[PDB]
A and B are shown apart, each in its own frame.
With several copies, the nearest count.
Chain A
């Protein structure tokens, strides 16, 4: 099964999920693990023997799922009888992503400089 579990996402969310939100969290954790496992092919091997690295992976996954699940219904406001509330604004275009700094926690990073190299085949 997945390294992180719906108890991790539940603990960072500070709400009990409903019976279908449990299924959503499990399908999203399966994506989050599979995204890390492509970028770091040894992920499960490192996680088996370095507990500090495993402790990062367990909440790099849970943060990535929580950013998506946190308001998955897309409400801004509701009213019920005489009770009503309104939320802060949030991005409607939500998708599962790992941040540049979260890749740096996993120990892999881009370089913002790269060189285009001109070439011509030498004669013979």
Chain B
């Protein structure tokens, strides 16, 4: 894109929200839900050993 715009005209952007800022709370609530229930860890945390 090419612009006549000048005299201080410029382009800038708002950043994305990082969705892992919620996912690392979803992992923390799966640890609590496993702790309260006493299920084997792999029933909730399917990446665990």
Contact = CB atoms under 8 A, between A and B. Distances in A.
Query: Do A and B interact directly, with beta carbons closer than 8 Å?
Result: yes
Interface of A: 112-116
Interface in B1-25: 1-5
Contacts of B3: 112-113
The interface size bin for chain B is under 10
A112 B1 contact: no
Nearest to B3: A113
B9 to A, nearest CB: 10
Chain A interface helix/strand/loop/mixed = loop
Contacts of A112: 3-5
Given A112-B4, A113-B3, A114-B2, 9 more contacts: A112-B3, A112-B5, A113-B1, A113-B2, A113-B4, A114-B1, A115-B1, A115-B2, A116-B2
A92 to B, nearest CB: 20
12 contacts: A112-B3, A112-B4, A112-B5, A113-B1, A113-B2, A113-B3, A113-B4, A114-B1, A114-B2, A115-B1, A115-B2, A116-B2
Contacts of B5: 112
Contacts of A113: 1-4
A103 to B, nearest CB: 14
Contacts of A116: 2
Contacts of B4: 112-113
Contacts of B2: 113-116
A114 B1 CA distance: 6
Nearest to B5: A112
